[PDB]
Design a protein around this ligand. Structure first.
Ligand code: J4K
Ligand code: ZN
Length: 258
């Protein structure tokens, strides 16, 4: 498979190899703030990243992934809509060619410059590969980025990108603290959905924070110097690696806040 984000292998083509592309619980979606309803039964959200152990940063030809040690309950997400414990495995971003696009989820059809996904798996399923086969296998915490002030907690990430320019490059990336990527508020929207890349599995509880983080133009500019290609191939800038909004179908988006 050679799926990607170009004219010839982009999101409108994915259904031919991945028919679940046209499924009943596909992501991302537009979040209509006037239709999402406050749900007073959501328990509080618990982001417990004090013991997070980052290992490595990888350019996989689709995004860059910061990977963590998930062999024990070191960094976990619990509470909110979630039953049980979800272990942080990695984070990555989706971004645009221009500051006015880049996010996957939209808010009243607004696109942000980028979107951060912190990916966690349900520890009751024992490993990540088993989890992705379950309707409640993953929890992805989504955080919008807007361009304004620099985010200091992002800069260690920006600064290593030069070293993983092309597909298949990785670098050691220890002692990175993902708490530095969080906004002040944990107010969120939640809905059931899917992975936003092939294989597009419908295994995700989405938790999308309402408060964006600000990053500087210089910071997002550096994302856009990455490459989708491997070393020694013609240069294709890693930009616009986002899937557009998919039909909501028979789903409700719940708000944690009034
Ligand atoms: Cl481990 C993993 C890495 C990337 C990835 O990108 C597609 C996606 N992003 N958010 N949900 N699905 C999904 C899972
Ligand atoms: Zn993602």
């Amino acid at each position: 498979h050679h799926w990607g984000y170009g004219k010839h292998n982009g999101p409108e083509h994915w259904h031919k190899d991945f028919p679940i592309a046209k499924g009943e619980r596909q992501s991302p979606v537009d979040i209509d703030t006037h239709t999402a309803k406050y749900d007073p039964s959501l328990k509080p959200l618990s982001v417990s990243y004090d013991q997070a152990t980052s290992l490595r940063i990888l350019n996989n030809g689709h995004a860059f992934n910061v990977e963590f040690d998930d062999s024990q309950d070191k960094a976990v997400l619990k509470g909110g809509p979630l039953d049980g414990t979800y272990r942080l495995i990695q984070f990555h971003f989706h971004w645009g060619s221009l500051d006015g696009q880049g996010s996957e989820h939209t808010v009243d059809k607004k696109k942000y410059a980028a979107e951060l996904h912190l990916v966690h798996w349900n520890t009751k399923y024992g490993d990540f590969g088993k989890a992705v086969q379950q309707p409640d296998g993953l929890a992805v915490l989504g955080i919008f980025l807007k361009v304004g002030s620099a985010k200091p907690g992002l800069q260690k990430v920006v600064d290593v990108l030069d070293s993983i320019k092309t597909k298949g490059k990785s670098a050691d990336f220890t002692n990175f603290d993902p708490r530095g990527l969080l906004p002040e508020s944990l107010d969120y929207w939640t809905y059931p959905g899917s992975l936003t890349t092939p294989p597009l599995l419908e295994c995700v509880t989405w938790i999308v924070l309402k408060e964006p983080i600000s990053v500087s133009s210089e910071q997002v500019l550096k994302f856009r110097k990455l490459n989708f290609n491997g070393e020694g191939e013609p240069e294709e800038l890693m930009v616009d690696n986002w899937r557009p909004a998919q039909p909501l179908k028979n789903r409700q988006i719940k708000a944690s806040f009034k």
